[PDB]
Protein backbone atom coordinates (compact mmCIF):
# COMPACT_ATOMS: atom_id res chain seq x y z
CA UNK A 1 0.00 0.00 0.00
CA UNK A 2 1.18 3.60 -0.04
CA UNK A 3 2.36 4.89 3.32
CA UNK A 4 0.04 7.29 5.03
CA UNK A 5 -1.04 9.95 4.19
CA UNK A 6 -2.40 9.08 0.79
CA UNK A 7 -5.49 9.81 -1.33
CA UNK A 8 -8.31 7.44 -2.12
CA UNK A 9 -11.59 7.93 -4.00
CA UNK A 10 -14.90 6.40 -2.86
CA UNK A 11 -16.27 3.89 -5.38
CA UNK A 12 -19.60 3.56 -3.51
CA UNK A 13 -21.27 5.64 -0.81
CA UNK A 14 -20.51 4.61 2.77
CA UNK A 15 -23.33 5.69 5.11
CA UNK A 16 -23.66 4.07 8.53
CA UNK A 17 -25.11 4.51 12.00
CA UNK A 18 -21.75 4.58 13.85
CA UNK A 19 -20.46 7.72 15.49
CA UNK A 20 -16.77 7.09 14.97
CA UNK A 21 -17.28 6.17 11.29
CA UNK A 22 -16.43 8.47 8.37
CA UNK A 23 -19.37 8.60 5.96
CA UNK A 24 -19.31 9.89 2.39
CA UNK A 25 -20.95 9.84 -1.02
CA UNK A 26 -19.74 8.13 -4.15
CA UNK A 27 -16.73 9.84 -5.83
CA UNK A 28 -15.54 11.57 -2.58
CA UNK A 29 -11.77 12.04 -2.41
CA UNK A 30 -10.47 11.15 1.07
CA UNK A 31 -7.03 11.42 2.73
CA UNK A 32 -6.14 8.18 4.52
CA UNK A 33 -4.24 9.16 7.68
CA UNK A 34 -4.04 5.76 9.40
CA UNK A 35 -4.36 2.14 8.42
CA UNK A 36 -6.26 0.52 11.35
CA UNK A 37 -6.07 -3.11 10.20
CA UNK A 38 -6.55 -5.20 7.08
CA UNK A 39 -10.17 -4.01 6.75
CA UNK A 40 -10.37 -0.42 7.94
CA UNK A 41 -8.82 2.96 7.12
CA UNK A 42 -9.05 6.14 9.18
CA UNK A 43 -9.11 9.36 7.24
CA UNK A 44 -10.62 12.69 6.46
CA UNK A 45 -12.08 15.07 3.92
CA UNK A 46 -13.38 18.62 3.87
CA UNK A 47 -17.15 18.70 3.42
CA UNK A 48 -19.01 21.37 1.51
CA UNK A 49 -19.41 23.40 4.70
CA UNK A 50 -15.57 23.66 4.79
CA UNK A 51 -15.37 21.45 7.82
CA UNK A 52 -12.90 18.61 8.09
CA UNK A 53 -14.56 15.42 9.15
CA UNK A 54 -12.79 12.26 10.08
CA UNK A 55 -13.34 8.64 11.03
CA UNK A 56 -12.96 4.98 10.12
CA UNK A 57 -14.31 3.37 6.93
CA UNK A 58 -13.77 0.12 4.99
CA UNK A 59 -10.88 -0.05 2.52
CA UNK A 60 -13.20 -2.01 0.20
CA UNK A 61 -15.32 1.11 -0.51
CA UNK A 62 -12.43 3.11 -2.00
CA UNK A 63 -9.68 2.92 -4.62
CA UNK A 64 -6.19 4.36 -4.35
CA UNK A 65 -6.01 7.61 -6.28
CA UNK A 66 -4.18 7.28 -9.61
- Characterize 12-51 residue by residue with b for buried, 16 or more Cβ atoms within 10 angstroms of its Cβ, and e for exposed: eebeeeeeebbebeeebebbbeebeeeeebbbebeeeeee
Complete domains list, the chain, with CATH = 1-66 (2.30.30.40)
How far apart (Å, rounded) are the C-alpha atoms in residues 5 and 45?
Answer: 12
Contacts by residues 9-16 (CB-CB < 8 Å, ≥ 24 positions apart): 9/62, 9/63, 9/65, 10/61, 10/62, 11/61, 11/62, 11/63, 12/61, 14/57, 14/58, 14/61
**C-alpha angle with apex 35: 29 to 39, nearest 5 degrees?**
90
Cα separation of 35 and 47, whole Å? 22
For 21-25, the CB contacts below 8 A with 24+ separation are 21/55, 21/56, 21/57, 22/53, 22/54, 22/55, 22/56, 22/57, 23/55, 23/57, 24/57
Way the structure was solved:
X-ray
Amino acid sequence: EPEVPFKVVAQFPYKSDYEDDLNFEKDQEIIVTSVEDAEWYFGEYQDSNGDVIEGIFPKSFVAVQG
